[PDB]
Amino acid sequence: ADAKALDELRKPKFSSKYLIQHVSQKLIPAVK
Amino acid sequence: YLAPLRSDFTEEITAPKVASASNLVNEWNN
Amino acid sequence: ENDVPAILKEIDSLVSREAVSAKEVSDAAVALTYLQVKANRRLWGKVLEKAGAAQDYDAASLTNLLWAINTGGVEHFKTVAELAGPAVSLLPSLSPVQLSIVVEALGGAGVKNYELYNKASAVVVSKIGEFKPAEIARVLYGVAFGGVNDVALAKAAGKVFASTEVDSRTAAQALYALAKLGRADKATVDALLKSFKKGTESASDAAAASFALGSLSFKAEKAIVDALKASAGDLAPAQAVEAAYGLALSGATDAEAFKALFGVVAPAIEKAPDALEVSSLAQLHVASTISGAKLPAAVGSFVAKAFGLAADAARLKRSSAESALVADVAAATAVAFGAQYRPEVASAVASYVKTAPDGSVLDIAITKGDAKVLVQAVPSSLLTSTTPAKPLGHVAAYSKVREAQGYAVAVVPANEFEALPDQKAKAQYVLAAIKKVAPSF
Amino acid sequence: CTVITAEPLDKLERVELTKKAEKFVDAGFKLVMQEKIDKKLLGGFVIEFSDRRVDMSTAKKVEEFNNFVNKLVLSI
Amino acid sequence: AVSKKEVLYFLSSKDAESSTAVKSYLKSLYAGAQVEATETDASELIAQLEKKYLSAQVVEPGVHNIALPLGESGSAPVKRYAAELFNLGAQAGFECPFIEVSKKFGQETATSETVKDVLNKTKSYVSADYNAALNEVLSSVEAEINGPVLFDGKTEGFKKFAAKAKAVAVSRGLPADTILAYCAGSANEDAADKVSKEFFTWFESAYTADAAAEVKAIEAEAASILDRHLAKPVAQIRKEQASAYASLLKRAETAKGAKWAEKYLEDVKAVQWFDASVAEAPASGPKVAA
Amino acid sequence: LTTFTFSGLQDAPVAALSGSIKLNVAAKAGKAEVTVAAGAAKAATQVSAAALRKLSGSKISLAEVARISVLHSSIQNYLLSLSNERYQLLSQWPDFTTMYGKDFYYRAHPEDLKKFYDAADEYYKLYETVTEFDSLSALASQVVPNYAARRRSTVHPAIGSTVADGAFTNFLLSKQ
C-alpha cells in the first residue's frame, strides 16, 4: 500500500538491467 | 515519462557530439 | 524544559525553510551529531540537501560541517564530494586543525579530487612544525583513503611520529592509514605502537590498531588485545570483524578476546545476517579458521559458504594482469611437474582448476592421492608498497584458510617471479616453492 | 599440403596435427608437410591441401565467433 | 532471482535491486541452504563475453543512480560525477580506465606488425583528430625512411617515429614524459611518487575534461530538445507525449512472459505510487517506512 | 565512509555560528554536557567521551528517493532551469492589454490591428507552452537512453577522448 520500504524505493526504476539479462540468458546457452 | 529500453554497446570512444545551439532566445527577443 | 524531540522537530522546521546559508546548516549538522540521531534519516537528509545547496562558505563553517558529516557516520558521496570545491577554494585560508579535519573528512568518503590532495600534501609538508601529530595523522588518513598512494607525507609523518610522543587515537589512525597504504614499515610501527600503554578510552582505536597490525601482519601487543577484550560490547559488528581479523592475522592467542569479539558478532548475524557485507563475512571466516574458537551452528557453515562467495567474487573481478600472472605461474608449474610441449602444458593447465569443497574454484590445484597442493599468486596489489616488497596479510589469511581444507599453499610473490628471464627458471622457482611446503610433490 | 602455424611445431602438436589432418583427406593418403610461419594467426594452424583449405585458426575462430555473437544479439 | 554467477558481481555494488537480491540470497543461505557449484568451465571467449554482458547488468543501473552536474558553478561537481563513474567502473569489475583502454589497445593489435595498421585497427578507440595527425606524421617519417615503419621498437625508423610522435603528443597538449615515466617506473619510490604526482594531476585534468565534455553535450542536447519543444502549441505536445507513452506502454504489455516487461510494468506502478504518495502529503514528500 | 573513524570530542566545534540556533559544550575532564538552545526549543544532554565513537559504528548511508531515476531527476532539473530561463524572458513581454480599448481600435490601420491581435494570441500560445511543466518528465526521457548507452561502453564507463589519447601515447611510444 503506502510507505512501502527504503530499498524498494532506492531502485533506479527505468534502467534496463533485464533486457541485458534477457539477451545474456538467451545468448550464452545458444553460443556455448 | 518512460523511455524505450535498449541493450546495445558502444565500442567507439568519440567526442560526445555537442549539438547546435537553437535560436529560440533570439526568436523570442525578436 | 529539557527535551530532545522538541528540538529535533525545531531543527526539522529550521532546515526545511528554503533560504539557508552555510552557517545555519553547519551549526545544524553540529547540533545534530551532538545528539546522536541515527534513527532519524529524513532530518540528516534535509541537512545534507541544504548543505549541498549552499554557496558561500567560511572556514569554520565548512570545517564544522565536514566534522559533523564525518563524526555522524553518514555516507552520502554526492553532497560531500561537491563540498570538495569549497575545500579547494578555501584551502590556504584553512587553519591547520581545520585543514586537518577538512581533508580527513573528505578522505573518509573517498573523494577522487587529486588537486585537493596534492595541494594539501604540499601545504602539510612545507610547514610541518605547526601540525600536531594528530593533524598529520588525520591528513595521512585522508590522503590514504582518498585514493592517493602518496609516500612523501607518509615519510614526513613518520619522522614526527618517531620524534615526539603521540596519543593513542593518533597512532591508531596513523597505523590504519599505513595499512590501507600498504607500507609495513617496522621502523615506524615500532615508534607508533609505544603509545598503546596507558589504555585507550575507546575501543575503535584499539580495533583499528589491531586491524592495521593484522593487515601489515607484524604481531599483537597483548594490551591492545586486552583493551579490546576489556569491554567488548561497544564495537560495531562491522568494526568487530575487522578487529578479529587483524588479531587472527597477527596470530592472537587470547581466545577469550576472540570469544568476547564474537559475542557481539554472533548476535548481529543471529538477528539479521543481511546487514553485513560479504567481504566482512569472509574476514569472519578467516578469523574463525585461524583462532578456531567455537561459533553457533548456523553461522559457522554460513561464513564457510560466504568465504567461497567472496573468493569467487574477488577472482571474477580479476585485474587481468593477475589473469596473465596465474596463467604464467600455472604454465611454469606444469613445466615443473613435467610437460615439455605446448599441447601437454595445455592439458596440464586444463586439469589444475578443481573446485574447493566449500564452493570456490581454485586456479592451481595439484592432486596425488591424499595430498593436495595449491599454488598462490600475489601480483602487486597484495604486496607492500615499500622497499622490502613483502606480501600483505590477506595472503597469509588465504594460505591459512586453504590449509584448513587440505591444501599446502606455496605462496609465489610476483616481484620474484616476473624477474626471472625464462620459463625453466620459473619452473625451478615453483619447484623450490612447492617442495619446501610439501615435500611429497 | 602446406601447413601454416603461428609458432614452430613441437613434436606433440606435429603428431596431433597429422592425426587431426588425416580425417580431411578421403583415403589413407600419406599427407606430406611444408611448415610455414605466419604470426597473423593467433595460434593454431591452417592446412592448405592446394585444392582446398581448412581454416583451423584462432583468428578465424574469434572472427566467426564475433559474427555469430553479432547475429544473435540483433535477433534476440 | 539470480543464477550463482550474477550474484558474484553484485557483492561489492550498492545498487538497490542487486543489494536486495544479494540479501535475499544470504537469507536463503543462512536459513538452511548449500551454495551451488561455481562453474570451472567456459573457455576464454565465453568468459570475456559473459564478463562483458554481466558487468553490463551492474553498470547500467549504476548510471541511473549517478546524477549529472548539468550547469553548475565550479569544476568540482564534474569531479563528483567522474569520481562516481570511477567508483562504478571499480564495482563493475573494470580496472583503472587508463590501463583498461591500454589492455584494449593490446587486445586490438596483437596481430599488427607495422605501424600503419596499428593506427588503422585502433581507429575506433582513439580520437580521429589525433589519428589524422599521427597518420600524417607517420607519412612524414615514411617519406624519411622510404620503407614501411615496423611496430617493433628497436627499429631506427620507429625510434625517429617515437621522437616525432612525442612532439605530436606535446602538440596535442598532453605531456608524454610524465606518462611514460609513470608506466616505465624508476628506482626509488620517491622519484616514482614525484612522477605519479604529475601523472595523477594530468589524469584528473583528462577525466574531468571529457566528463565536462559529456555534460556539455547533454546540456546542449537538452537545450535543443527544449527549443524544438517550446515551439509547439500545448495540445500537440500533450497528444504527442500521450501517444508515445501509450505506444511504448503497448510495446511492454505486448511482451507476455518477458521478465523485462513485467519489471517495466512494476516500475510504472511504482511511479504511479510515487505520484500518489506526493499527492497525499506534499509538505514532506514521499512516504518512506522508517 | 570507512568503518573506522577517528573524530569526536577532540578538535570539536566549541560554539555556535548562526543566530538561528545556539550551542555551547562542557569541555570537562572525562564527560561532556552539550547545551543547545534554539528559540522555543531547549535541549541539554550529557554525553560521554566514548559516546561519540560508538555513534559512527552504524552507518546512515543516505540515499535518494527518485520518481524515475536520480539521473532523470538531474535532467529534469536542468529542463526546469532552462524553462526558468525562458520564463524570465516571457516575463519581460510588454503589457498589451492596455491597448485593447476602442480608442486604439479605430485609430489604427486595420492590418496593424490584425497583426497586434495575432501577436497577443502568439504570446498566449508561448506562455501556455512554456508553463507546461508536466511535460518535462517526458522531455527528459529523450536525453536519457543515448546517454545511458554512451556510459555502457565496452572498455570503461568513465572513458573519454583525453584518457584514450594519453594511453595511446603510452602504447605507441613504448617498444611495441
Q: Which residue has the cell 606455496?
A: C410
E157 SS3 class:
helix
Q: Which residues contact E138 (CB under 8 A, 6 or more apart)?
A: E115, E116, E119, E149, E161, E165
Q: Which three cell numbers stand for residue F101?
A: 480599448
- Cβ atoms < 10 Å from Cβ of C370: 7
**Contacting residues for C210 by C-beta, under 8 A, at least 6 apart:** C220, C224, C225, C228, C243, C246, C247, C250
Nearest to E270 among A13, A15, A27 (CB): A13
C31 to C252, D27, D65, E1, F20: CA distances (angstroms): 41, 92, 62, 44, 12
C102 sits in the region (left: phi over 0; alpha: psi -120 to 50; else beta) called: alpha
> Please, what's the b/e burial string for C65-86 (b: 16 or more CB within 10 A of its CB; e: otherwise)?
bbbbbbbbbbbbbbbbbbbbbb
Closest residue by Cα to residue F159 from E61, E214, E57, E76: E214
Cα–Cα distance between C97 and C67 in angstroms, integer?
11
CB of E110 within 8 Å of a chain D CB? The answer is yes
Count of structural domains within chain D: 1
Give the C-alpha separation, C340 to F58, whole Å: 57
| Residues C222, C225, C226, C227, Cα dihedral to 10° | 130
What letter represents residue A18's amino acid?
Answer: Y
Beta bridge partners of D55: D46
Beta carbons of F168 and E105 less than 8 angstroms apart? yes
Q: What angle do CA E88, E91, E92 make, to 5 degrees?
A: 80
Q: Are C41 and A7 in contact (CB under 8 A)?
A: no
Q: Please report, for chain C, the start and end positions of each structural domain, with discontinuous segments joined by +.
A: 4-82, 83-200, 201-319, 320-441
Which helix H or strand E contains C169, and what residues bound it?
helix C168-181
For residue D52, which amino acid is it? R
Taking CB atoms and an 8 Å cutoff, what residues of chain F touch A12? 66, 69-71
Tell me whether residues E111 and D59 touch, CB distance under 8 A: yes
By the 8 A CB rule, do E114 and E151 touch? yes
The residue count for chain C:
441
Q: How far apart are CA C373 and CA C360, in angstroms?
A: 15
CB contact under 8 A, F70 and A15: no
Is D69–E110 a contact, with Cβ atoms under 8 angstroms apart? no
What is the per-residue DSSP string for chain F? --S----SSSS---B--SSSSEEEE---SS-EEEEEEETTEEEEEEE-STTTTTTTSS--------SS-HHHHHHHHHHHHHHHHHHTTSSS----GGG-SHHHHTTS-HHHHHHHHHHHHHHHHHHHHHT-GGGHHHHGGGTHHHHHHHSSBSS-TT--HHHHHHHHHHHHSS--
DSSP string, B1-30: ---------B---------PPPSHHHHHH-
The rounded distance, in Å, linking the Cα atoms of C285 and C291 is 10
CA E236 to chain CA centroid, Å, is 37
C410 beta partners: C375
Nearest CA among E74, E212, E68 for reference residue F77: E68
User: How close is the nearest chain D Cα to the Cα of A20, in Å?
Assistant: 10
Q: How far is F137 from chain A (nearest CA, A)?
A: 13
| Contact criterion met (CB < 8 Å) for B10 and F154 | yes
Distance between F84 CA and the closest CA of chain E, angstroms: 12
> From which experimental method does this structure derive?
cryo-EM
Q: What is the CA radius of gyration of chain E?
A: 26
Which residue is associated with the grid cell 578479529?
C244
What is the C-alpha to C-alpha distance for residues C139 and C142, in angstroms, rounded to an integer?
5
Collect all residues of chain F within an 8 Å Cβ-Cβ radius of residue E49: none
Instruction: Determine the residue type at F136.
Output: L
Closest CA to F57 of A19, C239, E283: C239
**Whole-angstrom distance, CA of residue E265 vs CA of residue F2:** 38
Cell 585514493 -> residue = C147
DSSP string for residues in C365-407 = EEEETTEEEEEEEE-STTB-SSSS--B-HHHHHHHHHHTTTTB
HSE-CB for C40 with a 13 A CA cutoff: 15
- Chains touching chain C through at least 3 C-beta pairs below 8 angstroms are D, E, F
Instruction: Decide if C332 contacts C420 (C-beta within 8 A).
Output: no
Q: Chain A residues within 8 A (CB-CB) of chain D?
A: 22-23, 26-27, 30-31
- How far is it, in rounded angstroms, from Cα E91 to Cα E82? 14
Chains within contact range of chain B (3+ C-beta pairs < 8 Å): A, E, F
CB F140 within 8 A of CB E52: no
Query: Cα separations (Å) of E2 from A9, C282, C291, F66, F173?
Result: 20, 21, 34, 25, 45
Describe the strand order of the beta sheet including D44-48 as a list of residue ranges.
D2-5, D44-48, D53-57
Q: Which three cell numbers stand for residue E96?
A: 583503472
With the C-alpha atoms ordered C149, C150, C155, C161, is the resulting torsion angle positive or negative? negative
Distance CA C226, CA C260 (A): 11
d(CA E83, CA E67): 12
- Smallest CA–CA distance, residue A9 to chain B, in Å, is 17
- Main-chain dihedrals φ then ψ at residue F23, nearest 5 degrees: -155, 135
One-character DSSP codes across E116-146: HHHHHTTTTTS-HHHHHHHHHHHHHHHHHHS
Q: How far apart are CA B27 and CA E227, in angstroms?
A: 11
Instruction: Report the C-alpha gap between C72 and C82 in whole angstroms.
Output: 18
Contacts of E179 (CB under 8 A, 6+ apart): E199, E202, F166, F169, F170
**C226: three-class secondary structure by DSSP:** helix
Do chain C and chain E touch with ≥3 beta carbon pairs under 8 Å? yes
Task: Record the cell numbers describing residue F92, joined without a space.
Answer: 519581460
Rounded to whole angstroms, the Cα distance separating C299 from C301 reads 6
Task: Please answer yes or no on whether D69 and A26 come within 8 Å at the CB atom.
Answer: no
CA proximity to C354, closest of C336, C340, C373: C373
What angle separates helix C393-402 from helix C203-215, to the nearest 10 degrees? 80
Q: Residue E55: count other Cβ atoms within 10 Å of its Cβ.
A: 22
d(CA E278, CA E69): 25
Cell of E180: 611514460
- Cβ contacts of F115 within 8 Å, gap of 6 or more: none
Contact F153, E84 (CB under 8 A): no
Distance from CA of E207 to the nearest CA of F (A): 7
Name the grid cell of C58: 567560511
Strands C410-413, D2-5: parallel, antiparallel or unpaired by DSSP? unpaired
In sequence order, what are the residues at sequence separation of 6 or more whose Cβ sits closer than 8 angstroms to the Cβ of residue F29? none
Taking the C-alpha atoms of residue E286 and residue F7, their distance in angstroms, rounded to an integer, is: 34
Q: In angstroms, rounded to a whole number, what is the distance separating the alpha carbons of residues C85 and C116?
A: 9
Contacts of B20 in chain E (CB under 8 A): 220, 224
Contact in structure between F89 and B28 (CB atoms under 8 Å): yes
C426 neighbors C417 (Cβ within 8 angstroms): yes
Task: Say if residues C339 and C345 touch (Cβ distance below 8 Å).
Answer: yes
- Indicate the Cα dihedral angle E286, C10, F10, C244, nearest 10°: -40
Buried b (16+ CB within 10 A) or exposed e, C238-273: bbbbbbbbbbbbbebebeebbbbbbebbbebbeeeb
Residues E265 and E267: their CA atoms lie apart, in Å, by 5
How do D53-57 and F22-25 pair as beta strands?
unpaired
Please tell me the distance from the alpha carbon of residue E216 to that of residue E208, in angstroms, as a whole number. Answer: 12
The CA distance from C71 to F54, in Å, is 10
Which of C340, C341, C344 has the highest number of chain D CBs within 10 A, making it the mutation to test binding with D? C341
Cβ C274 vs Cβ C306: under 8 Å: no
Q: Which domain holds residue D56?
A: 1-76
Quote the CA–CA distance of C407 and C357 in Å, as a whole number.
Answer: 11
Resolution to one decimal, Å: 3.7
How many angstroms separate the CA atoms of C130 and F23, rounded? Answer: 29
